[PDB]
Amino acid sequence: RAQERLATALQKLEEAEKAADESERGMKVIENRAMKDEEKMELQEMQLKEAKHIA
Amino acid sequence: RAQERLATALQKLEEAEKAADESERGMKVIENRAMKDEEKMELQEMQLKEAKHIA
Amino acid sequence: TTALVCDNGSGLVKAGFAGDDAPRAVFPSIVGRPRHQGVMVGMGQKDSYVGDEAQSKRGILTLKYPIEHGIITNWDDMEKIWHHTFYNELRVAPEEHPTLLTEAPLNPKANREKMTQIMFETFNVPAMYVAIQAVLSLYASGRTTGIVLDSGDGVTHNVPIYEGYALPHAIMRLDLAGRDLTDYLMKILTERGYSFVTTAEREIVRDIKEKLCYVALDFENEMATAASSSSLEKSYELPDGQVITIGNERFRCPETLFQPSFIGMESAGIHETTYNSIMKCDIDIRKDLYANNVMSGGTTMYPGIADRMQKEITALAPSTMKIKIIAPPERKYSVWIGGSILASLSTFQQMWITKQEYDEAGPSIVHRKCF
Amino acid sequence: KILTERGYSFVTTAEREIVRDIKEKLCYVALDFENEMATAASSSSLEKSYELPDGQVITIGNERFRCPETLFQPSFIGMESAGIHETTYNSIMKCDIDIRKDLYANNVMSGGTTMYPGIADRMQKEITALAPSTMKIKIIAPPERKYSVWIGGSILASLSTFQQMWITKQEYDEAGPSIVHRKCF
Amino acid sequence: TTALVCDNGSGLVKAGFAGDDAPRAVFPSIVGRPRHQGVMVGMGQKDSYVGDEAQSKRGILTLKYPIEHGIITNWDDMEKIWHHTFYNELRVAPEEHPTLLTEAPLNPKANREKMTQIMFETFNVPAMYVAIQAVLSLYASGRTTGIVLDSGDGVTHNVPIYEGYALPHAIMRLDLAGRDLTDYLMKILTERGYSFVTTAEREIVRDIKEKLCYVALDFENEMATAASSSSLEKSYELPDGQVITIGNERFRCPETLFQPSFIGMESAGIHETTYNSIMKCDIDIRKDLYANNVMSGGTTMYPGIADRMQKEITALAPSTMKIKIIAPPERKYSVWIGGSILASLSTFQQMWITKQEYDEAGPSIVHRKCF
Numbered sequence A, B: 001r002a003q004e005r006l007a008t009a010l011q012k013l014e015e016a017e018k019a020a021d022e023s024e025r026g027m028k029v030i031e032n033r034a035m036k037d038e039e040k041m042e043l044q045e046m047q048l049k050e051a052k053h054i055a
Numbered sequence C, E: 001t002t003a004l005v006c007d008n009g010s011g012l013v014k015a016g017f018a019g020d021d022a023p024r025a026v027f028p029s030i031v032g033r034p035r036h037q038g039v040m041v042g043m044g045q046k047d048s049y050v051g052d053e054a055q056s057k058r059g060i061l062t063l064k065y066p067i068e069h070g071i072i073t074n075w076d077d078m079e080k081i082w083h084h085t086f087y088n089e090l091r092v093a094p095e096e097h098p099t100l101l102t103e104a105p106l107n108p109k110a111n112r113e114k115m116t117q118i119m120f121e122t123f124n125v126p127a128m129y130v131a132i133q134a135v136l137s138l139y140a141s142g143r144t145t146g147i148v149l150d151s152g153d154g155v156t157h158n159v160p161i162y163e164g165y166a167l168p169h170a171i172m173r174l175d176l177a178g179r180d181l182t183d184y185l186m187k188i189l190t191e192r193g194y195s196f197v198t199t200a201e202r203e204i205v206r207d208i209k210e211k212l213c214y215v216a217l218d219f220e221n222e223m224a225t226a227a228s229s230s231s232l233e234k235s236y237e238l239p240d241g242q243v244i245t246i247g248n249e250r251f252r253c254p255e256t257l258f259q260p261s262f263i264g265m266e267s268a269g270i271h272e273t274t275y276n277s278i279m280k281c282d283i284d285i286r287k288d289l290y291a292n293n294v295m296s297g298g299t300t301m302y303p304g305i306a307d308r309m310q311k312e313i314t315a316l317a318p319s320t321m322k323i324k325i326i327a328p329p330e331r332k333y334s335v336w337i338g339g340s341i342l343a344s345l346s347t348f349q350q351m352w353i354t355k356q357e358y359d360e361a362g363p364s365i366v367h368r369k370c371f
Numbered sequence D: 001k002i003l004t005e006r007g008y009s010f011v012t013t014a015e016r017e018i019v020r021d022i023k024e025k026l027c028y029v030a031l032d033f034e035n036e037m038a039t040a041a042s043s044s045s046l047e048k049s050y051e052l053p054d055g056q057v058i059t060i061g062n063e064r065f066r067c068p069e070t071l072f073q074p075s076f077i078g079m080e081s082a083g084i085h086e087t088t089y090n091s092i093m094k095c096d097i098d099i100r101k102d103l104y105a106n107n108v109m110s111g112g113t114t115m116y117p118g119i120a121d122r123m124q125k126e127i128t129a130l131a132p133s134t135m136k137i138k139i140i141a142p143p144e145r146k147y148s149v150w151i152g153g154s155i156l157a158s159l160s161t162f163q164q165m166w167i168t169k170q171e172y173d174e175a176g177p178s179i180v181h182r183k184c185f
């Protein structure tokens, strides 16, 4: 049984590491999109201001 | 050594899962924020439009 | 005809029809009354709102949950709640519908009795029945053994069941639940400068708790971390702007469930009461109970609670025992789901309490095996 | 536990002492459980009040004899073993047959838990129902029995034929704590 | 050497040396600045008066209490206050004097932190310490148990203490105090035609309150009486003659403390928060707490407040409990007195926060048990 749960711990360990790797390049792309939303909100907020002023 | 490496696998699995899931909470909230900034851009470019209209 | 399944609880009323897959109507179990005088004649303001109506009119009301810790204190507000449920949320004449009702274990018998009496007199149901929330929660999980840890908004009980048999002497009720966590959060939120005192803004604090809080896998490490870095701070928008930020609080608040000393209580933590309830049962059924720790109720919906719970109860139990924690993703409604399942049986259709039988034997009938 | 079903909740280790006082004052054994249950159901001549350390008097009825009844029906607390009377009778029956009459006649009773109003009478009734009919059942229940252990201890220690059963410091130094199990008992 | 005891509070700063019997210097904690321009050259008018100087120059200034509800908001005015205290009210070099500071419970931790930091940097004390006003108020009354109801000018808290132990989970802070009563009096004084709007004449109203108001043992009877007769009207002469009269107001104003609804607040009255704080405490210590309701702070100096308070809290408590209200005749300074007592101890002389220790550990040291 030691060999059994060793093998299980091993495999499940690496697959959960791979799942974390999926979630973490996902977190990389989502923080990239976070900065995307930062710059988009910045630009659009600026143009909102100039719109209000000109109006 | 089976049980010691098994304990290593357990703690690693667990902390990696918690990291994956906190990044998952982060991805939830950033998808939310992304849609948020999306409709933000929509409405504020729109008020820019009507500002240009009446301008 | 179909039966109704109204799970009162504190904080949230959950009603629906037996056999459905989820409670149809869900609304906060509060009653509000205006606390100013009103000046616009012809507005015809009613005198007491209820449910989501009150939750929306919060700004000018004073809200009062009519259930404190599983027990019903204001009976008139409770009757208002029930009447509003039946006639607006479900829009159903309760005269031709057996209704299922739930209550925590170890409650004042007068509570259950008066519940039965009001049900049969005011609303005049054809039949009714009162069930233990934890048994229903086990039903909804497809199990037949295992201890269940329900933790709603007012109370928190453990019920060990094995092969459908309950061990009553090992039931552990504990009066620490979501309302207490909300209050402790209101308290520790002062030390940043935020002051919520009104019964209205207690709801704001409840929302903050449901959104930002989480359980820490290791309290000391998270404390030291939040001290060093600032990667734990998150912001929040109040109903009038003025975004606020909370750090340490996010995991200090629900930590109470494991260290009740934070709010001055003396009883042991959640993991401790669970383990004790296990140890009270006979030795032959302890492995299965270790394997089948069900969890229900809205308070068990914190990000990370199952992992911390497993860690602790593993630290307490022997090493050669497999600890598992059954935490479904819809566990908030597990009690109502189990109630629907049970009421949908036919081997159950002879356990109801018939109006005639009540008229024959009085409210004392409930404690009898017409349970 | 059973005080909850009236609305009274004591959970603190402090107020466990309050509950112990309530038990020592109001509880009592009932000669016939079913009759007393039916009686408490019908009338209210059994309710007695009690003032807590902050006023707010409480009242208990059925509990007064539900609580100490456990000793005769341990199932109330989930234990499986037999009741007090039953274990007494069994202990009798395990003894040799020639000494059972005297044991029937000399049921001594001590300790503070045997200080309930009525416990001796119920005890006698039960153990009489178990034993044969031609045996005399008696129950020695002194009024100071709560201290009978200490009293007997003083009596024994005051003997002189006992002054050679002690365990001397020198002897223990010579033979280690294993000496106790030896006939230096 | 001697220790300093500065009890900031709102409304009134009171300072003195440890071991003394009463605070040497007592002056209003306000800062004034001229709001006109001034035309006489060579007059050399300074730019901001402080304390009694400002209270005398009221006519041409704009006064601004730098403490709102126990919390410090304008830190520069607070530093001005402290500096003026040390260098003019006491004529003492603060470099060689450990100072004792007070604050209400449940305050922003940043407040106390910045307090410590400024104390060690600007004034450069050798050591200091921050104490809870209510604990000191208990010290000054020779007690060691009993709940204390401090109510200064900005905040109002109850702190149940037993045998020298404090039960923090039962502390009840409430943000209704003398300033709010002053404002409510300013408001209801309009309905006689008297209009006070300036920050100067707010002080006039404060004096009117301190002189003519009182608590009514029974509100309805006193209302009906003032309606029928006129034996309750008393007059008062403003700083320019034009005597005024007030009737109903005399007891309508301080009644707020028992019916906070008068000013739109939702919390329960003073007696109610007291009784609730009692009930939150363990049952074994409730009789002593009932018997030792200490009071302090200037707001508890209304003629009749102790009798009304006893009446109410007796109506709430069981009948077989002895209610007593310890209301000394000097209770306004009980906090400072207790502070002097404590600072004068020697078993206390190792609880200070040494400047070396602070330099070693930074302002975060205060929350640490160097409390």
Ligand SMILES: Nc1ncnc2c1ncn2[C@@H]1O[C@H](COP(=O)(O)OP(=O)(O)O)[C@@H](O)[C@H]1O
Residues within 6 Å of the ligand: C008, C009, C010, C011, C012, C013, C151, C152, C153, C154, C155, C178, C179, C182, C206, C209, C210, C211, C297, C298, C299, C300, C301, C302, C303, C332
């Ligand atoms: N996502 C969440 N995280 C933490 N706590 C929650 C969450 N959702 C709800 N709660 C808490 O759970 C309570 C609802 O639990 P519920 O099962 O409805 O109680 P009851 O059974 O008494 O109705 C709410 O009062 C809320 O404070």
Ligand SMILES: Nc1ncnc2c1ncn2[C@@H]1O[C@H](COP(=O)(O)OP(=O)(O)O)[C@@H](O)[C@H]1O
Residues within 6 Å of the ligand: E008, E009, E010, E011, E012, E013, E151, E152, E153, E154, E155, E178, E179, E182, E206, E209, E210, E211, E297, E298, E299, E300, E301, E302, E303, E332
């Ligand atoms: N005789 C009195 N009657 C009623 N209220 C008073 C009286 N004297 C002072 N006060 C009020 O009490 C306040 C002073 O309380 P104090 O203990 O100085 O508060 P703090 O502790 O915040 O300095 C003043 O603002 C005043 O309004």
